[PDB]
């Protein structure tokens, strides 16, 4: 919980992803705008709570000092291998740990933001390790998180 000076200049750049008006402070309305642009729908109270756990002076908004301080307490990261495996499992229709290459192409070209058929070709080339037209997604996820 002690920040490198490198990272201080880094989080100032981060601060502007949040301070939608260059105000020098982050309000709940800006935090809601940001949260919603990441696909989340926090309530007004949840936004106030987020600010309130960071707002040292109690003026209802987050300055860069309180922003930068609250990063220092959450620098610890952990791997996402199991969460990514569970996203693949969503498409494991038979729950047998395999997704066919055809089905993975169908998913990647139709759901979410999508990939081009060319992009999906490279992904399946890596994903179908055994060349059998089937993706053992735990093994593929292990390869990508190595």
């Amino acid at each position: 919980a002690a920040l490198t000076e490198e990272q201080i200049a880094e989080f100032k750049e981060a601060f502007s992803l949040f301070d939608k008006d260059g105000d020098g402070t982050i309000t709940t309305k800006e935090l809601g705008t940001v949260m919603r642009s990441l696909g989340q729908n926090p309530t007004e109270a949840e936004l106030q709570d987020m600010i309130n756990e960071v707002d040292a002076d109690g003026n209802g908004t987050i300055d860069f000092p309180e922003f930068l301080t609250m990063m220092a307490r959450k620098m610890k990261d952990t791997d996402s291998e199991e969460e990514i495996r569970e996203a693949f499992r969503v498409f494991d229709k038979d729950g047998n740990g395999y997704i066919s290459a055809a089905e993975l192409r169908h998913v990647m070209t139709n759901l979410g933001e999508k990939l081009t058929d060319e992009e999906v070709d490279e992904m399946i080339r890596e994903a179908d390790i055994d060349g059998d037209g089937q993706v053992n997604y735990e093994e593929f996820v292990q390869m990508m998180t190595a």
């Binding site: 880094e10 949260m35 987020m50 922003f67 996402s80």
Partner: protein, 95 residues
């Protein structure tokens, strides 16, 4: 770089009780858990004749308090992941 790692989720819940409503809810609901646990135990094990309507009453209030506590616990986990979302977004400037 960080690759596919994301901010680690918090251990115990020493946080977001800055929300005065949540901490009021926790303490009222916890006290009611204590209250109905006592009253159920007394009414089943410390009496000569069990009054089943009394037990049902305190079972309703007990489940109500337990589930209020659960709903506070889930809200704290949601608040923590909402904050971890912003930490994770801020951390993308370290690359």
């Amino acid at each position: 770089g960080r690759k596919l790692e994301l901010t680690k989720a918090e251990k115990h819940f020493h946080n977001f009780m800055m929300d005065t409503q949540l901490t009021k809810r926790v303490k009222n609901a916890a006290a009611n858990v204590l209250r109905e646990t006592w009253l159920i135990y007394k009414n089943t094990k410390l009496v000569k004749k069990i009054d089943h309507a009394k037990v049902r009453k305190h079972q309703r209030k007990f489940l109500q308090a337990i589930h209020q506590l659960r709903s506070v616990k889930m809200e704290q986990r949601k608040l923590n992941d909402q904050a971890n979302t912003l930490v994770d977004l801020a951390k993308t400037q370290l690359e």
